[PDB]
């Protein structure tokens, strides 16, 4: 992708995550499970909502009619009517197809950036208390219970709390 | 601790708001408007030359000589013709002004 997160170091997605678009998977002594990140998912949904609304809101319904047919004398104007309808038809078809193709790639890249920032927020939070094992995973060098797991997700994580606990395991190897 | 260095962006007292594809009413430090939404509310002189006013009497009466079209703007130059919507005095004698639409642009 453009940001290298989706189909990048994270090769595949989670089918078990059915509560949000982006989230975490934890594995501690108490148990394991999926949990979506609320901040990233809700903002993304509103952003894509605004993107879709930005396209279709102005495209309002029009009153149409067959109109008067053209007699033999009304040939030149009939050709002009064909010219304008075809001209608008060609322009609208080209613009609609082009906009969808361009915006779809931007939409895909939007998810790529949202996933990447989530990984960086965790990566910057943990710092040396975890190991980057790849595929978006973080092997903790210390003991992380459920409270510790949620602290990273809520953004209220404390590096000094497990600094010495991890450091002993870092210097172990 | 000790010495520190930071990286940040600029902020000011701007109240300008812009609408993006993903977000609405986004505050921006600077912006440019491309749409003029103000009008002075008066009919001015175009290219320096003042227009031609006619009042309740329309062009047809003015060029024909309607008796109500007697005292009005008698000028040699005009940028454009101004007709009030309430223009009723005109072709008092019933009839049709042939090529009236053509004459209106000719006398414009």
């Amino acid at each position, epitope marked *: 992708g453009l940001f290298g997160a989706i189909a990048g170091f994270i090769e595949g997605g989670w089918t078990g995550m059915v509560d949000g678009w982006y989230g975490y998977h934890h594995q501690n002594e108490q148990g394991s499970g999926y949990a979506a990140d609320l901040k990233s998912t809700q903002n993304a949904i509103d952003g894509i*909502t605004n993107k879709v*609304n930005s396209v279709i*809101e102005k495209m309002n319904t029009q009153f149409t009619a067959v109109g008067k047919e053209f007699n033999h004398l009304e040939k030149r104007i009939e050709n002009l009517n064909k010219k304008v309808d075809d001209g608008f038809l060609d322009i609208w078809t080209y613009n609609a197809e082009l906009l969808v193709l361009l915006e779809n790639e931007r939409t895909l890249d939007y998810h790529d950036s949202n996933v990447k920032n989530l990984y960086e927020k965790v990566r910057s939070q943990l710092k040396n208390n975890a190991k980057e094992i790849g595929n978006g995973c973080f092997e903790f060098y210390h003991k992380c219970d459920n409270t510790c797991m949620e602290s990273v997700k809520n953004g209220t994580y404390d590096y000094p709390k497990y600094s010495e606990e991890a450091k002993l395991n870092r210097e172990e190897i | 601790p000790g010495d520190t260095l930071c990286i940040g962006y600029h902020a000011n007292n701007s109240t300008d708001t812009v609408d993006t594809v993903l977000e609405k009413n986004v505050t921006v430090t600077h912006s440019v408007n491309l749409l003029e939404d103000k009008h002075n509310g008066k009919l001015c002189k175009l290219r320096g030359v003042a227009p031609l006013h006619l009042g309740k009497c329309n062009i047809a009466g003015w060029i024909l000589g309607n008796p109500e079209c007697e005292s009005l703007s008698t000028a040699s130059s005009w940028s454009y013709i101004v007709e009030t919507p309430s223009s009723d005095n005109g072709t008092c004698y019933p009839g049709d002004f042939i090529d009236y639409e053509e004459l209106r642009e000719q006398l414009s």
Partner: nanobody
Amino acid sequence: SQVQLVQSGTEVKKPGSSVKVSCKASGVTFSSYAMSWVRQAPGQGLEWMGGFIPILGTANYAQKFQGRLTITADGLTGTVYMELSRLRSEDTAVYYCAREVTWKGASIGVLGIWGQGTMVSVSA
């Protein structure tokens, strides 16, 4: 601008039946804003039932309404329908529909624009 949500008229239904309530918008056609349904028993508080997200194309309901509620939307027209089956006298309330939007654009958590309300009465 000044969008108003117009719901269907008040309906009197027998117990154990199914009632469908429409929620049509005005102004800009072809909107994709998220919508929600909320009921209020006479003299009681507000109760959230469910909501629809046209972007996802799916709907989510509260636990008590899972299996009885069916929130549908007519494409992107902005009209959203509500279906409740196996009606009881405890469901007699005023039902509202709300558009989830602020002046900051789409807002999934809020209910900026509300409907006119639809009273539903249930008895044999």
